[PDB]
Structure 1
Amino acid sequence: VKKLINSQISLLIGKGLHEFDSLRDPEVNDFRTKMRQFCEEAAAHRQQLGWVEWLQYSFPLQLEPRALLVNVKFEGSEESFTFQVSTKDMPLALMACALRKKATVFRQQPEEYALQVNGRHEYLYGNYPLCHFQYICSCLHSGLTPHLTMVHSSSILAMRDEQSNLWSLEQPFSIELIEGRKVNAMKLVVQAGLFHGNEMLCKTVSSSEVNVCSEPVWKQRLEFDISVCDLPRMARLCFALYAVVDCPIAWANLMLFDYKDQLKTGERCLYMWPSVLLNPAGTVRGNPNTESAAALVIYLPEVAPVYFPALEKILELLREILERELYEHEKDLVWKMRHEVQEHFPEALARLLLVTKWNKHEDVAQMLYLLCSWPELPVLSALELLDFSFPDCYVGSFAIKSLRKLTDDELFQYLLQLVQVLKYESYLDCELTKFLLGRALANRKIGHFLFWHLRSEMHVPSVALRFGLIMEAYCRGSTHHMKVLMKQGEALSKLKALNDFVKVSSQKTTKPQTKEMMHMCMRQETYMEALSHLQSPLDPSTLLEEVCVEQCTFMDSKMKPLWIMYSSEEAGSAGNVGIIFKNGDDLRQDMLTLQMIQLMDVLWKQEGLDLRMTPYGCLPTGDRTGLIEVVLHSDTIANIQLNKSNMAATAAFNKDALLNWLKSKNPGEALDRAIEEFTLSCAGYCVATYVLGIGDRHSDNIMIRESGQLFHIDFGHFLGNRVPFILTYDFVHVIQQGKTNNSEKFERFRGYCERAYTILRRHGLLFLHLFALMRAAGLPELSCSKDIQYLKDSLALGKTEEEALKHFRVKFNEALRES
C-alpha cells in the first residue's frame, strides 16, 4: 500500500520518485530521508491537536485586516433558525442561542461546537466579534444573510481521524580547466570567478583563446588571487564559456564545499546552461539535459581530507549620519565600530554584513561571533537578509529565526517571495525549506499554496529536482491532503484538454457551435466527475461542487480562456462561484501584482482606510497555465461604454454611459453608496497602478462591480516595462455625481489618493524587500535593479513625506488636465 502512496505522489508532483533514486545522489538521498521523518513527526504531532487546534490547522480563521440577520442550522436536520445578533457578539453567544432554540423545539453547551460557513471549508470560532470574520463582512457589504452550521466537536474529531496515514591551507586557490565540448562558429575563452553572493571574492581569471572547432583541450591552471584558508563556507566558483574574435555561449556555477562541508576534490564535469557575463546567482547544479548541454571538465587540486571549521572553532577566532552603497573609508568606519553596531544599531546588521571582508577568514569569524550574540531582528529586517546578497548560511539561518514569529497571515502574504528565495539556496537541505515545510504542515492553507507554488514550476529544469523533493516530503506529512490536491490536479488536467478542444474547434467552427461542443464534452462522465466536487486551487476554503455546464463558455480572444461556473445546494448563493482557466499566458506577473495590491489593501485597512479593493484570486498551476477567480456581478468598462441600445444604460452622451449603468444597478437610495464604492475603489487602483507602474490601462482591462466597485484586470505590464498617472474623465464624471462642477466630492477623492499614497510610502521598505526577493523568480520585467529603482521613484522613498506628497500632486495635476 506504501506503493500507491508513492505512485500517486509521482502523479501529483509530476515526476517519478524512481528518478530521484536514479540519480544515486547522496545529497538527494539524505534530503528525502531526513525530511520524511520530519514531516511524519509533524503528521503524528498533528495527529499528540485538540478538535479546536485541528480547526486552526485545517480551517484557519479568515479575519479582515449594529444588528444583522444570521441563520444557523445543525448537521442532522435541514430545518433552520434565523436569529438577530449584533456584529459585536462572539460566535459563542450565537451558538448559545442556537442550542437554546434547538432545546425549545426538541424536548429541551456552546463550547463544544463550531460554526461552519455553509458549503465552504471556513469556520467561525474564537473570541472574536462577528464583524471580525471576513465571511460576515462579505455578507454585510453584499446584504446577504450569513448561513452558518452548528458543527459538534465529535464530527470534527471524525474529520481529523479520517485523514490518517582548515586554516592551515595558506596556498592560493586554483583549478584545472581540462576539456568540454561546445558549439559555435573565431576563438574561445573560459572566464572563471569566485563569488560570495553578488560580489567577487577575488579577481576573476580568464582562459587562453582556443579554436572553435572543438571540443578542445586546455589543461590550463587557473590560479585565483585568494588563499584556500580564506574561502568562505558559501563560496561559488562561477564559470563563463564564451566565443570571441563577444558572443556568450554558456555558464556554470559550483560550490567549493559539498553539503557535508568537505572541500571538493577533484575532477568534475560541469554541464553548462545557455547564456543571455558571469552568472553568480545562477543554480549550482548542472544542466539535467546532459545530451545537448555543453560540458566543462575541471579538476580540483588535492590539498591534503579537510572540512570547513565547525562553528565552535570559528567562535574561537560618524555612523548615525550615514544611516538612511557606501564609500570605502565609510565601510572601514562601520567595520571598525562594529561592536557599537550590535549594541546600539541592531537592525543595521545588513549594512555591517556588506562591509565584512568575506575573502578573509579572520574577519568572517569575528563577524559570525557577533551574529551568534546578535539580538532578534524584526520581520522587515529578516526579509532583507533572505536575499542573495547575504549568501552566508549562518546569516540565512539567522534570518529564518527572526521569521519564526511570522503570523500565518503574514507568512501567507510573503509566501510567494519565500518560495522564490529557494532558488538562491546552494543545497537541497536548508533552514528555509524546513521552515516552509514546518509551517505548511501546521497550516493546511499554507501547505495548499506552498504546493501549487512548487508544482507550477516543475516544467523548469533548474528547480524541478528541488521543488519535486519538497512536495514529496510534504506529501509524507499528509497523505490525505495529497489526495485532495490530486483531485485538483485531475480537474486542471481535464480543463487543459477541454481548452485544447475549444482552441481547435473555434478555428474551424463558429463560437455558438464551439460552445455547444464544449458542453457536450463536459457532459462526459470522465469530465463531470473530474471537474466536480473539489477545493478551488485559488482558495481551498472555497468548494467547487456541481459544475453548471449551461453556464460554461469561453472568450473569443487569443487563448480562448474557459469560463467555468459552479453551484451548490448547500452554500446557497455562496456556492454560485466561478473560475477562469487560461492556458498560454505567464500568469506569474498577474499573481504578483494582485498580491501586492492585496498587500496595499491590508496596509490601508489596518490604518482604517477601506478603499473597497477587489483582490481576486490568481494562481499559476503549470507552464503558462493557471486559474483566475471569477468576480461575479461585474462587467468591463468597454462593454458598458459600448452604449448598447435596447437597454437601461443607454445614454444621450457617452459620458453618462457608466453613470447610467450604476443607477440601473443601484436604484434610488442605493445609488449614493455605489458612487462612494466607485470613488474609493477608483482612488485605490489608481494609486496602485501608479506605484506598481501598470501602464496600458484601457477600458478592456478595467472592470466594475454592480456595487460600484472599480477593479483592474490583466496586469501583464508593471514597473513601466516610466508610467505617468492614469485619470480618465468618465470616472471623474461618476465621482462628481455627473455634474461638471463638484469640488468637495472631488477634493475628497483627491484626499483619498494622497492618504493611500502616503500609507504605502511608510511601508515602502516592505515593498522594496519583497520585490528584491522576487528577482529570483526570473520575471522578465523584474530582473535588473533598474526595475527596483522604478518602485523607489514611484514611492519617492529617499524624500520626505511632504516633499513626496508635494511631488505626488504634481503628476496628479498632470493627469487631470490631459483627462
Structure 2
Amino acid sequence: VKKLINSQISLLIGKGLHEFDSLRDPEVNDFRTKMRQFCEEAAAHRQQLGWVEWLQYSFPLQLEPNRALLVNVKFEGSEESFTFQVSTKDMPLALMACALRKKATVFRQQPEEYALQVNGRHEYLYGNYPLCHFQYICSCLHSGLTPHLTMVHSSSILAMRDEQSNLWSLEQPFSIELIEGRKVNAMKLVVQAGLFHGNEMLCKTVSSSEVNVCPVWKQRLEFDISVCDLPRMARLCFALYAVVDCPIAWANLMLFDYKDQLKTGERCLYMWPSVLLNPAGTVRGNPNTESAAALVIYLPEVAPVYFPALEKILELLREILERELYEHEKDLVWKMRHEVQEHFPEALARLLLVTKWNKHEDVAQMLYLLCSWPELPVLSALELLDFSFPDCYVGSFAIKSLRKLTDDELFQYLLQLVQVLKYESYLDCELTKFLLGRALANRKIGHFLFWHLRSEMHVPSVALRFGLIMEAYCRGSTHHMKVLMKQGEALSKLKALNDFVKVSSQKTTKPQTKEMMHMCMRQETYMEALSHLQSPLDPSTLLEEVCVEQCTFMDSKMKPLWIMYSSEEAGSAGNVGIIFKNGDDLRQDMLTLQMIQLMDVLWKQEGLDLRMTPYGCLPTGDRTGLIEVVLHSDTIANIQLNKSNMAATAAFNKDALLNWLKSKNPGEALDRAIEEFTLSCAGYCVATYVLGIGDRHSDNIMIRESGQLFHIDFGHFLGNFRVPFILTYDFVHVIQQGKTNNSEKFERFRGYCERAYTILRRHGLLFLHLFALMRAAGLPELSCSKDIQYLKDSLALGKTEEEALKHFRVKFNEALRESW
C-alpha cells in the first residue's frame, strides 16, 4: 500500500522517487518531509469538511465575470425527469424546491439537503446566485440548449468525500579561490565572476587571468564588497568564455545555505551551456555530471556563520516623480522612506529598488519599514514576485499580500506564479507552500498546478523542484493522483498512436491511415486507456466513451489527432473533442490564449461580451499538448475554397463567408450571426493588435456556424516575425451585411474596437506585471525589455486616455486604407 503509492507517484511525475534519495542532499530531504507533512494536514482538514465545503473543493463554482428558460431536472436513482419553465433570476434553491414538490406529487409523498449536478459533468450549481450567473446556464442560453441537472443529496456527496480519503563583526572584502576546470572548446579562457542581488550587481564584474584552452587558474578573486554587507539572497554568478568573444558555459550559486549559514569550503560547479553573465538562471548545477563542464572554486573559512535573525535586523518634488530615475531622485526617495510608508504604501516597489543591498545597515532600515508595512493590493503584490525583488522578506510580504487572492483570481494567474518558481533560490520557499496549500484546498487549482509542473519535467533545470512539488501534492491527494494517472495513461497511448499516424501518412493514403488508426484505437488497451477520464484541459469536462469512427488526424506537419468523445448521461453537452499535438512547443499558445481569456474577463466585468472563443490549450509534456475542439467551426480558407454542389456557392469570392453564414443560420437566425461575427471580430482585432499577433492568413482564422470569429496558431506574438491594426475587406463586408456602403453597422463596430481598447488600457499594468513574471519561462519571444516594450506602445500606457484614443484612431484608419 505505502510502497504502491510510491511506485504510483514515480510513474505519474515521470521520475523515480529513488532518484531524490540517491542525491543524499539534506535540502531535498528537508523539503520532502516538511512538505509531505504539510500536505497530509491539508488532506486531513479536507476529509472533515462539511458536504457544501467538499463541493467548493471538488466542484468549485464556474461563475460569469429577468428572462424565462426551460430546465430539465432528474434525481440520482431514476431515469424519470421533469421540465420546468423557470427564470434566470431564480437561485438554484428555488429550482431544487420545485423539483422536490414534483417528486412528492409523482411519488405520493428539504431543498437545503441537495446540490444540482450538471449532467455528465464534474460541475455543480449551488449557493445564492441567480441561474444566469452560472457558466453552464449561459452556455445553454447562448447555444439554444436546455440545461440538464441532477438533484444530488447530501449523503451521496459525503459518500464521494469518504471514498476519496488517503555577521557584522566581519569587515574584510569578499573573495574566492578559482582553482580549475574540465570543459570542451577550440584561443584562451577567462572566467568572469560577479555578485548579484537579483537583476542588479552588488559590485563590479571581476574577471580572471587568460589561461590557455589546454584549465588551471588557482587565483584569489577579490570583490569590492564586505562579508558583513552580503545580503541573505546574495548570488555569486560565473561565466566561462573563450577569447583571442565566444560564450561557453555559465553557473550560479548562493553564498548562504537553506539553513542561513554562509557556505565553506570546496565547491565543484557543474556548468550549464551558453547561447554576458546570467544572474536569473538556476543556482543548482547541471545534473549531467558526465557530459558537463565543471568549475572548482574555494569558499574561504571565516572562523559557523549564520545570517542574523529578524529580531537582530529589526533592532538595527517627491510626488512629481511618483508617476528609471536619476541618482539624486533615488537619494530623495530613500531619505523620505518613512513618508513613503505612511502616505505612499503602493510606491513600496520603488523604495525597494532604491535601497542599497550592498550595505547591511540599509537593508535592516528597509526591512524595518517592511515589517510594519501595510498590506498591498493584488496588483502591487504581483510586481514584487519578480526577480527584480529577490529578498526573502520581500517575497514573504508579497505572498502575505497575495493571500487575499480569490480562487478565480489565483486560477487566472497560476501560469505566471508557476513560472516564478524558476526564480526561487531554495526548495523550501513561501511560493511553494502557498501553491501546494491553495492546490489542496481546490481540485481545479491542484489539477492545473500538476499539469504546469508535469509539462516541464523533461526540462533538467526544473526537474528536481517540479518533481518534489508534485510528490508533495500527491501525498495530500491520493485519489487525485490516481485520477491524474488515468489522464497520463490516455496521453501515453495518444503519443504512440500519433507516432504511427506520422509514419503512416508518409507511406499511404489518408483513408488507409485513418482506417488503421481506428483498428489500433479499437484494441482492448487503447479502448480502456482513452475512455473514462477527466479532461486535462478541463477537470469539469468528462471524456467518457471514445468515438473511434469520428476520430481522425489533421494534415499539418505534425499530424495532430482529432479525438472525439460522447456520454449517454451528458447528452449533447457530452459530445466533446480534444486535439492531440506532438512536435511543437505549445507554451506561447497557452499564454496568448490565457491573455485573450483575461481580456474577455476584463471586458465582461465592464458589461461587454465581445463573443470570444477562449478554447483550451495545455502543454502536457515534451513538445506535447492538447487543444480543445471548438465544435461546428471551420477556417476562413476552407469556406473561401468555394466548392460546387454546396449551400455556400458564391458568384464572387467576397460573398463566400456571408453565404456560409446564411446556410448555417436560415431566415431570421442570420441577423444574430452577423452581430456575433461583428463583436468577435472587434475583440480579436484589439487582442491581435495589442498582443502583436502577426502572420495572419485565412487558414489560421476560424468561424463558428453561430457566426463567431476566432484565431488559431499563435506561434508568433509581441511583434516578432511592430504589427499594425488589421482590417480585412472580407470581414468588413459581413459586418455591412453584404453592402458596399453601410456606415451605421461599421461605426458601431468601430465603437466596439474603441471601447474594447480603452478597457484594456485601464488594466494595462496587469498585462505588464503578468508578462514580466512570464520572462522566467524562457519563451524566445519574451526574453527582454524590447518584448515588454511592444505592449507599452500597443497600449500607449504612457499617454492619457484621450491621447491614446487618437493614436488608436490613426492605427484603425490606416488598417481601413490598407483594406484593398
TM-score bracket, normalised by the shorter chain, equals: over 0.9
Note the C-alpha offset of 1:426: 0.3
Deviations 1:532-588 (A, max 9, x none): 000000000000000000000001110000000000000000000000000001100
SS in 2 for 1:321: coil
Deviations 1:759-792 (A, max 9, x none): 0000000000000000000000000110000010
Note the C-alpha offset of 1:166: 1.1
Aligned length: 817
CA distance in 2 between counterparts of 1:154 and 1:613 reads 39
Note the C-alpha offset of 1:49: 1.1
Deviations 1:484-518 (A, max 9, x none): 00000000000000000000011111110000000
SS in 2 for 1:671: helix
Deviations 1:717-749 (A, max 9, x none): 000111111110010000001111100110000
Q: What does residue range 175-324 of structure 1 map to in structure 2 within 5 Å?
A: 175-213=176-214, 216-324=215-323
What's the counterpart of residue 171 of structure 1?
172
TM-score normalised by length of structure 1 = 1.00
CA distance in 2 between counterparts of 1:752 and 1:323 reads 33
CA distance in 1 between counterparts of 2:705 and 2:323 reads 46
SS in 2 for 1:305: coil
SS in 1 for 2:216: coil
SS in 1 for 2:201: coil
Note the C-alpha offset of 1:346: 0.3
Q: What does residue range 49-88 of structure 1 map to in structure 2 within 5 Å?
A: 49-65=49-65, 66-88=67-89
Note the C-alpha offset of 1:276: 1.4
Q: What does residue range 337-736 of structure 1 map to in structure 2 within 5 Å?
A: 337-721=336-720, 722-736=722-736
SS in 2 for 1:724: coil
Note the C-alpha offset of 1:130: 0.3
SS in 1 for 2:421: helix
What's the counterpart of residue 145 of structure 1?
146
CA distance in 1 between counterparts of 2:623 and 2:536 reads 16
Deviations 1:427-451 (A, max 9, x none): 0000000000000000000000000
What's the counterpart of residue 112 of structure 2?
111
Bigger mean CA deviation after superposition, 318-327 or 428-437: 318-327
CA distance in 1 between counterparts of 2:761 and 2:556 reads 38
Note the C-alpha offset of 1:181: 1.0
CA distance in 2 between counterparts of 1:360 and 1:47 reads 50
SS in 1 for 2:457: coil
SS in 2 for 1:325: coil
Note the C-alpha offset of 1:108: 1.7
Deviations 1:231-262 (A, max 9, x none): 00000000011010011001000100000000
Deviations 1:148-204 (A, max 9, x none): 000001000000000011111110000000011111111110000000001100111
Deviations 1:561-617 (A, max 9, x none): 000000000000000000000000110011000000000000000000110100000
SS in 2 for 1:206: coil
Bigger mean CA deviation after superposition, 132-141 or 319-328: 319-328
Note the C-alpha offset of 1:458: 0.2
CA distance in 1 between counterparts of 2:487 and 2:319 reads 54
CA distance in 1 between counterparts of 2:169 and 2:695 reads 61
SS in 1 for 2:402: coil
Q: What is the RMSD computed on CA atoms of the aligned residues?
A: 0.5
SS in 2 for 1:644: coil
CA distance in 1 between counterparts of 2:347 and 2:469 reads 33
What's the counterpart of residue 329 of structure 2?
330
Note the C-alpha offset of 1:323: 1.2
SS in 2 for 1:182: coil
CA distance in 2 between counterparts of 1:807 and 1:535 reads 47
CA distance in 2 between counterparts of 1:45 and 1:399 reads 26
CA distance in 2 between counterparts of 1:556 and 1:604 reads 36
CA distance in 1 between counterparts of 2:664 and 2:229 reads 71
SS in 2 for 1:737: coil
CA distance in 2 between counterparts of 1:78 and 1:170 reads 81
CA distance in 2 between counterparts of 1:586 and 1:726 reads 26
CA distance in 2 between counterparts of 1:304 and 1:282 reads 31
Note the C-alpha offset of 1:136: 0.2
CA distance in 2 between counterparts of 1:275 and 1:316 reads 44
Q: Which runs of 5+ in 2 are unaligned?
A: none
Deviations 1:253-280 (A, max 9, x none): 0100000000000110000001111000
CA distance in 1 between counterparts of 2:311 and 2:275 reads 43
Note the C-alpha offset of 1:319: 1.4
Note the C-alpha offset of 1:31: 0.2
CA distance in 2 between counterparts of 1:499 and 1:182 reads 39
CA distance in 1 between counterparts of 2:352 and 2:3 reads 48
CA distance in 1 between counterparts of 2:442 and 2:43 reads 12
Note the C-alpha offset of 1:304: 1.2
CA distance in 1 between counterparts of 2:318 and 2:120 reads 59
Deviations 1:371-409 (A, max 9, x none): 000000000000000000000000011000110000000
CA distance in 1 between counterparts of 2:127 and 2:701 reads 39
CA distance in 2 between counterparts of 1:625 and 1:575 reads 25
Note the C-alpha offset of 1:48: 3.4
CA distance in 1 between counterparts of 2:556 and 2:752 reads 36
CA distance in 2 between counterparts of 1:394 and 1:563 reads 49
Deviations 1:52-97 (A, max 9, x none): 0000000000001011000000011111100010000000000000
CA distance in 2 between counterparts of 1:611 and 1:217 reads 65
Identity %: 100
SS in 2 for 1:94: helix
CA distance in 1 between counterparts of 2:341 and 2:148 reads 54
SS in 2 for 1:254: strand
CA distance in 2 between counterparts of 1:648 and 1:776 reads 50
CA distance in 2 between counterparts of 1:427 and 1:162 reads 36
Q: Which runs of 5+ in 1 are unaligned?
A: none
CA distance in 1 between counterparts of 2:183 and 2:624 reads 34
Deviations 1:632-672 (A, max 9, x none): 01111110011111110011011110001111111111111
Deviations 1:678-704 (A, max 9, x none): 000000011000000000111100000
SS in 2 for 1:218: strand
CA distance in 2 between counterparts of 1:529 and 1:185 reads 55
CA distance in 2 between counterparts of 1:644 and 1:758 reads 41
What's the counterpart of residue 29 of structure 1?
29
CA distance in 1 between counterparts of 2:811 and 2:87 reads 45
CA distance in 2 between counterparts of 1:553 and 1:158 reads 39
CA distance in 2 between counterparts of 1:439 and 1:810 reads 46
What's the counterpart of residue 18 of structure 1?
18
Following TM superposition, where does structure 1 have runs of at least 4 consecutive aligned residues deviating by more than 4 angstroms? none
TM-score normalised by length of structure 2 = 0.99
Bigger mean CA deviation after superposition, 283-292 or 181-190: 181-190
Bigger mean CA deviation after superposition, 765-774 or 314-323: 314-323
Deviations 1:117-149 (A, max 9, x none): 000000000000000000000000000000000
